[PDB]
């Protein structure tokens, strides 16, 4: 769908994060691990101890990518075509962990924002991390 | 499944921590707000037009308790996870014709909800005490299959 | 996410098949009610009895709507509209019982195309049905 | 997962017909098509560009007989299907790193497989009879993942 309520609650929690969301997404991306060992396998360089700079590093990347994605939300297959390549050609990424990364980083946003994450964010969010995890998956299908 | 003496540990300090009622209820509830298809299965709860009655519609809150009161049957035998719910993936399947993928979704729906009442309580380990814990009851929901 | 080369397999493949499209479905849906059992639920009404007018009534048009998207693969979601909505929120139908589907067809059309049912072809079909039954639950979520 | 002779002898007495090699190799060398991102761990492989070349490459040919001499095992053992690919799944898991879900998928190929093989003799009623054995096998390489 992404209607208006979810532009409205997909750009309004994505605030309440401000510089936040790298910790969050550092935070997203060791649970996984820890829920889902197998995840760990196409991390395999990084040192995936609780702290990690590279993780840390990493959570950077994934809390940017999709904070410019929150925003064009109009265009989410163009600003996510940056990284579709890479996860779906470049590194040949299973599309079951997009299901159990963006259960990690809500979980993360739950934990940390609950005033916040109420149903309906929560749903506008899952019909938003889908939508970047269905582009992700594009390029080999 | 397996649980390591330290991670049914933390699975019972933090099931105490945590009212579990309205868990089951802010759980259910938000499963047919997030996944509105499942609620196909009760339209005899009137209305479900939106997330406001969604979660203010008191046999929502009803079941939920219900669910989770066997969802504790569940941390209280886990080991033993298939009998308790012997009966109940017989209903969720056969009398009431659920998706058994659905089992998980909701499964999933618990984890967050644990985290949202607990907060910076829920480690990433913590956190996958309970993930085992969700895949354990779902897994042992969708069995009955012959 | 289609093509390029991918809609002349589709078109190609869809070729053989012919005035055999509406009867395929009709089996595929047995198929489906044999292999995936609630997937019956969603049809109270139909007698799911191997041979029925009901299934066999139902599935032409099932082999009409694919056939309809073999014609208009630059946009589906437009043609597929009506069915876009009446799956979502009038018939309430599980998305994981379309992948159940697609893959029921695919037992369907290997039975019947032993000389046509070829990788890149059975890909190029795996698809077809992908982007379909995307497309189609673009209006729950 | 047991069934009356009806269907449970169907799938011995239709197994009978085809080779089970021929079958492996296919259903392999398929899921490697459908599914390209499965080629990953596929790197000590070689050539697997277009489905002619992943069709032939004779160690996708080579690895069709192992998946299946394994599915044999689970053939006989219908029973036993959880400890006795007990080995595998460790394999599958600790060293391979494959996601679970793929032997579903990879059952779904040997399924779509074994009625491109069979056309006719393969029914709905013998269909799924199968795959309760495919999805069977998937939920016996995944028990050790965790
Ligand atoms: C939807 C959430 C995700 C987003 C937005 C995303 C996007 C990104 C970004 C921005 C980078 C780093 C680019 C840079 O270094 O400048 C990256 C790298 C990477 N991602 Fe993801 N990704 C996501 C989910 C996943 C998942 C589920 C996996 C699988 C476990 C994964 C695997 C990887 C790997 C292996 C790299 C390379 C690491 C490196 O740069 O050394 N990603 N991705
Ligand atoms: C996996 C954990 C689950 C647990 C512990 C659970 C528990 C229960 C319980 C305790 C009941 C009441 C039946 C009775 O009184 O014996 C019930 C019924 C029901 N459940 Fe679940 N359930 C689970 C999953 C699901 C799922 C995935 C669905 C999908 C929609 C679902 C939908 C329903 C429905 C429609 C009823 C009938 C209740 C009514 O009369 O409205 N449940 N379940
Ligand atoms: C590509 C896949 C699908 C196609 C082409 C398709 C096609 C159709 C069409 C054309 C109609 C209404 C047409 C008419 O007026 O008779 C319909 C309704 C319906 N579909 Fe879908 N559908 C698909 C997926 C599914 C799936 C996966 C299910 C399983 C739950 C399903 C179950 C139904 C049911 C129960 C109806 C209403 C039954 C009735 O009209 O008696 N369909 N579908
Ligand atoms: C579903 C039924 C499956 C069975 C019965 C099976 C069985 C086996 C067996 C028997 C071996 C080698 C044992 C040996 O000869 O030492 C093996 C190895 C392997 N498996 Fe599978 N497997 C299955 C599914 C999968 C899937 C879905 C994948 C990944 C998409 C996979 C990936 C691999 C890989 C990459 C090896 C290479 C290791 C070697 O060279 O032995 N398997 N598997």
Same mark, same amino acid.
């Given at each position: 769908?992404?209607?208006? &309520?979810?532009?409205?609650?997909?750009?309004?929690?994505?605030?309440?994060?401000?510089?936040?969301?790298? &910790?969050?997404?550092? &935070?997203?991306? &060791?649970?996984?691990?820890?829920?889902?060992?197998?995840?760990?396998?196409?991390?395999?360089?990084?040192?995936?101890?609780?702290?990690?700079?590279? *993780?840390?590093?990493?959570?950077?990347? *994934?809390?940017?990518?999709l904070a410019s994605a929150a925003g064009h939300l109009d265009?989410?297959?163009?600003?996510?075509?940056?990284?579709?390549?890479?996860?779906?050609?470049?590194?040949? *990424?299973?599309? #079951?962990?997009?299901?159990?990364?963006?259960?990690?980083?809500? #979980?993360?946003?739950?934990?940390?924002?609950?005033?916040?994450?109420?149903?309906? #964010?929560?749903?506008?969010?899952?019909?938003?991390?889908?939508?970047?995890?269905? *582009?992700?998956?594009?390029?080999?299908? | 499944? =397996?649980?390591?003496?330290?991670?049914?540990?933390?699975?019972?300090?933090?099931?105490?921590?945590?009212?579990?009622?309205?868990?089951?209820?802010?759980?259910?509830?938000?499963?047919?707000?997030?996944?509105?298809?499942?609620?196909?299965?009760?339209?005899?709860?009137?209305?479900?037009?939106?997330?406001?009655?969604?979660?203010?519609?008191?046999?929502?809150?009803?079941?939920?308790?219900?669910?989770?009161?066997?969802?504790?049957?569940?941390?209280?035998?886990?080991?033993?996870?298939?009998?308790?719910?012997?009966?109940?993936?017989?209903? =969720?399947?056969?009398?009431? =014709?659920?998706?058994?993928?659905?089992?998980?979704?909701?499964?999933?729906?618990?984890?967050?909800?644990?985290?949202?009442?607990?907060?910076?309580?829920?480690?990433?380990?913590?956190?996958?005490?309970?993930?085992?814990?969700?895949?354990?009851?779902?897994?042992?929901?969708?069995?009955?299959? =012959?």
């Amino acid at each position: 769908v992404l209607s208006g &309520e979810d532009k409205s609650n997909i750009k309004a929690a994505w605030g309440k994060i401000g510089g936040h969301g790298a &910790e969050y997404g550092a &935070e997203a991306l &060791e649970r996984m691990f820890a829920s889902f060992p197998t995840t760990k396998t196409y991390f395999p360089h990084f040192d995936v101890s609780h702290g990690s700079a590279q *993780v840390k590093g990493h959570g950077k990347k *994934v809390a940017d990518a999709l904070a410019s994605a929150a925003g064009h939300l109009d265009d989410l297959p163009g600003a996510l075509s940056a990284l579709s390549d890479l996860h779906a050609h470049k590194l040949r *990424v299973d599309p #079951v962990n997009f299901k159990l990364l963006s259960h990690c980083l809500l #979980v993360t946003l739950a934990s940390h924002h609950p005033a916040d994450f109420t149903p309906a #964010v929560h749903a506008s969010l899952d019909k938003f991390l889908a939508s970047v995890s269905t *582009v992700l998956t594009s390029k080999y299908r | 499944v =397996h649980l390591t003496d330290a991670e049914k540990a933390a699975v019972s300090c933090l099931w105490g921590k945590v009212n579990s009622d309205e868990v089951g209820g802010e759980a259910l509830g938000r499963l047919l707000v997030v996944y509105p298809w499942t609620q196909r299965y009760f339209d005899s709860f009137g209305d479900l037009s939106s997330a406001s009655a969604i979660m203010g519609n008191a046999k929502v809150k009803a079941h939920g308790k219900k669910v989770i009161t066997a969802f504790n049957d569940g941390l209280n035998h886990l080991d033993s996870l298939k009998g308790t719910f012997a009966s109940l993936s017989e209903l =969720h399947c056969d009398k009431l =014709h659920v998706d058994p993928e659905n089992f998980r979704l909701l499964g999933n729906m618990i984890v967050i909800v644990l985290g949202h009442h607990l907060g910076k309580d829920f480690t990433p380990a913590a956190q996958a005490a309970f993930q085992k814990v969700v895949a354990g009851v779902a897994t042992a929901l969708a069995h009955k299959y =012959h």
